Amino acid sequence: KQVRWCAISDLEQKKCNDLVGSCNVPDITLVCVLRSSTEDCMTAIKDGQADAMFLDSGEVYEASKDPYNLKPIIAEPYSSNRDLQKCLKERQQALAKKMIGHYIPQCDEKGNYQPQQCHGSTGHCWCVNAMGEKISGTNTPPGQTRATCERHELPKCLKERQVAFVPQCDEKGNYEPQQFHGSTGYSWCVNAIGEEIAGTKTPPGKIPATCQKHDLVTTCHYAVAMVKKSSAFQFNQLKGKRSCHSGVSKTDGWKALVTVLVEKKLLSWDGPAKESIQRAMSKFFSVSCIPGATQTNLCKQCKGEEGKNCKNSHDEPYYGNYGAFRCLKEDMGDVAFLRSTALSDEHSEVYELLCPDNTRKPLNKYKECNLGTVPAGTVVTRKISDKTEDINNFLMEAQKRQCKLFSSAHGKDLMFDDSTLQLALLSSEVDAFLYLGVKLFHAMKALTGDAHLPSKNKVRWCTINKLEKMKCDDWSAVSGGAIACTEASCPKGCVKQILKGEADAVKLEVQYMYEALMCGLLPAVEEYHNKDDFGPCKTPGSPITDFGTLRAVALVKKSNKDINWNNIKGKKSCHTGVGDIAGWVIPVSLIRRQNDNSDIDSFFGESCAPGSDTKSNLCKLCIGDPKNSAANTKCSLSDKEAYYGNQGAFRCLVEKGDVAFVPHTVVFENTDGKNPAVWAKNLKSEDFELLCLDGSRAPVSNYKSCKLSGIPPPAIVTREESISDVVRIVANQQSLYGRKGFEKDMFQLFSSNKGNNLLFNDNTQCLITFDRQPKDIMEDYFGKPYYTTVYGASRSAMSSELISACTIKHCSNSLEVL
């Protein structure tokens, strides 16, 4: 019902009052809280005196910590080569605007851009490639012959696959990051457009380089150094010069420049633990105006009034990009460090750029004469997110109602970057780390001084609950400084901690694996479950007969002789639950692979898949709670189902089913006398059969050959610089607290008085160092069958915030490169 925005200057508050008066959003009132600087506004938000504010990307990492503890919530979205049905989304967003006479993208039947796009109110038309970009030169006014529009929707990867080394592309048609030559056995990594990145080519037999995912994006902004053409100094002569900066905490004003100076060996400084950055910089420049700085000489050139001088605020006239430009123009500085948004051609007469290659270039080449790419700013609120909903509602309704958000007659870049086109809500999961990405986050961390000092003799294990934490603390007490503990909420959070340099290793089930391997983490060791062969564990290296991995299988009655694999469409199927690998994942994957219509809600009839829609066919014959008429619990992902799990899905094949999808063990777990005492009394393991791929059958004890696929074992993961460490520290720790370890009376790695299946599954036999075969990482852990069947042998089969954070954003002028 009310949203308080924090303004850092008088001009920002004037724009805020303007928007209070003009922008009428129903049921949400706007309020302007005035503070004197950026930091004061952050504090006011932390104190609940205000609700949200805009921040530069560089100010984000320090905002997520004490004494602010803020999180990003609303950012500007970038166009990329990963967007799907972009025309439909853009058309919807345009139709949602409360205005008339604006361009509403025209879509065809299939959700693709019409090659010709017209602006209705003006009569202008133009041509457009698949991603909506205007083909240069095709804008035609009314009354003039329209440019004939071709259909530019063939991607470059598919255009290269034809006329043919044959690359591998994904379902949409982009480049797979890992490329493998079929003629000459080799492996390398490629760009977002197919360019081979140097230093990655690998002859066969050798392990291949770990390739990283690339997204091609447009409209990137950069940090630049600007100098008047009359001056004659270069980059490595900055020492002693007078500088103008946008702000002490901005990326375009401070942080990128510092990273460059350090890499260029120009800044006399070693580490942030013994001397702050501002000291070294104050000794580097003579006099400067760097808003927010605490060194006297770094504020001499500023022109703010008494008390307003050198603040992170427009009250300081030299604050911001345009403030630094004004500082350079009035000759209060020799070089201005700012963003490529303040660039204009009206300035290309007097001003030029100053490249880190000790050369000068005109403004228009800012793409090749810069200090780094600068991500867009973000709206931030309290990490507790008590007001995210209201802020998002107000901002998006103001965008629909065409309020003057990203412009003002009072000044430039007030409240928001004036270069902002549209603001969109981020996932609630996104914090500073997920927003900045792994690389940029680690860079911010190393710059602020929180860089962790790696220990090659201590592994920090991550726990997912308090019971795991208690077992970890027992292990750490009996460990002798080799095992430490960290706390997280879910395995995904542990992977985040590992990538943030706050933890070292963690055991992941296969379901969490695809993301982990996608972010550069490798398997150090794996969980052995073969209850019958302790050979490979007592002498580390003795060959492995079988790993004890689960085998997903389809189990049927010998009574129903007609059910074969090539006719499973329509039969009552049985699933352990929506999410389980053997009970749900493998079958639906193989189905959408072999039957191209790929509809599983209609493929089966009256299946029991606990976890699907209560009204669909996937929740019939699901007897929910036999003796509980006080609650309807049918089709639930809990034991309140009489069909959840291996046992519950086995009840289905004997009751009202024709086929079940379970691990192979279930048949031997509830038959042949070793069964509970209700429904599987006189049932034997001979009365059942398995379904194989070629459409035949076999006895149950053929799960090695008549199998759907193989389930990869749970794996302990860590970073590549810790493998050789973690492995050995595991080995040392396994000869002491394993099953046949020396001090098994002190502690067991595979049992606990605090709970069951903590840290590792209780039926685990031992841990084995993951051998790194010379092939793809996913193909090595998952195995070619599982990989190809579930993920389609692709690195684009999944999209989450974490993979988006492990992504290199390849900047380009446009996606027209096809």
Domain locations along the chain: 2-79+376-443, 222-373, 459-547+713-780, 551-710
Distance CA 652, CA 629 (A): 21
Same fold, 459-547+713-780 and 551-710: yes
Cβ distance 550 to 711 under 8 Å? Answer: yes
Distance CA 222, CA 631 (A): 60
Helix, strand and coil content of the chain, in percent to the nearest 5, comes to 25, 15, 55
CB atoms within 10 A of CB 235: 20
**Closest to 669 (Cα-Cα) out of 644, 690, 655, 648:** 648
For 285, 288, 328, the CA distances from 301, given in Å and listed in that order, are 12, 5, 10
Q: For helices 438-448 and 256-263, what crossing angle results, to 10°?
A: 80
210: its two tokens: 């770990």
Q: Which distant-in-sequence residues (6+ apart) come within 8 Å of 229 by Cβ?
A: 350, 351, 352
Cβ distance 152 to 129 under 8 Å? Answer: yes
27: its two tokens: 């049921």
145: its two tokens: 């012959």
For 231, 544, 666, 811, the CA distances from 639, given in Å and listed in that order, are 77, 36, 17, 50
Distance CA 705, CA 702 (A): 6
Cβ distance 174 to 155 under 8 Å? Answer: yes
Q: How far is CA 421 from the centre of its chain?
A: 23
CATH class of 459-547+713-780: alpha beta
Spell out where 488-588 has E strands.
Answer: 506-508, 522-527, 551-557, 573-575
User: Phi/psi at 253 (nearest 5 deg)?
Assistant: -115, -15
3-state secondary structure of 447: helix
Buried b (16+ CB within 10 A) or exposed e, 294-324: ebeebbbbbbbeeebbbbbbbbbbbbbbbbb
**In the beta sheet, which residues pair with residue 378?**
55, 75
Per CATH, the homologous superfamily of domain 2-79+376-443 is Periplasmic binding protein-like II (3.40.190.10)
Residues in the chain: 818
Pairing state between β 483-487 and 459-463:
parallel
Q: What is the DSSP letter of 78?
A: P
Cβ distance 810 to 216 under 8 Å? Answer: yes
Cβ distance 530 to 548 under 8 Å? Answer: yes
**Closest to 506 (Cα-Cα) out of 534, 528, 529, 483:** 483
Q: Please give the CATH number for the structural domain made up of 222-373.
A: 3.40.190.10
Architecture of domain 551-710 in this structure? 3-Layer(aba) Sandwich (3.40)
User: Phi/psi at 750 (nearest 5 deg)?
Assistant: -125, 30
Distance CA 419, CA 478 (A): 57
Long-range contacts of 339-346 (CB under 8 A, 24+ apart): 339/221, 339/222, 339/223, 339/224, 339/246, 339/252, 339/374, 340/221, 340/222, 340/223, 340/224, 340/366, 340/370, 341/221, 341/413, 341/417, 341/418, 341/419, 343/224
Pairing state between β 688-691 and 697-698:
antiparallel
H/E run at residue 262:
helix 256-263
1: its two tokens: 């019902």
Cβ distance 337 to 324 under 8 Å? Answer: yes
Spell out where 577-714 has E strands.
Answer: 659-663, 688-691, 697-698, 709-710
Cβ distance 319 to 311 under 8 Å? Answer: yes
For 30, 35, 61, 314, the CA distances from 49, given in Å and listed in that order, are 14, 11, 22, 21
State the burial class of residue 100 (Cβ atoms within 10 Å of its Cβ: 0-12, 13-18, 19+).
exposed
For 64, 392, 426, 517, 668, the CA distances from 55, given in Å and listed in that order, are 12, 16, 15, 32, 60
321: its two tokens: 């990009």
Long-range contacts of 757-760 (CB under 8 A, 24+ apart): 758/467, 758/468, 758/471, 759/461, 759/463, 759/468, 759/471, 759/472, 759/475, 759/507, 760/507, 760/527, 760/714
**In the beta sheet, which residues pair with residue 508?**
715
Distance CA 235, CA 671 (A): 79
End-to-end CA distance of the chain: 46
Distance CA 474, CA 483 (A): 10
Cβ distance 436 to 496 under 8 Å? Answer: no
Cβ distance 705 to 696 under 8 Å? Answer: no
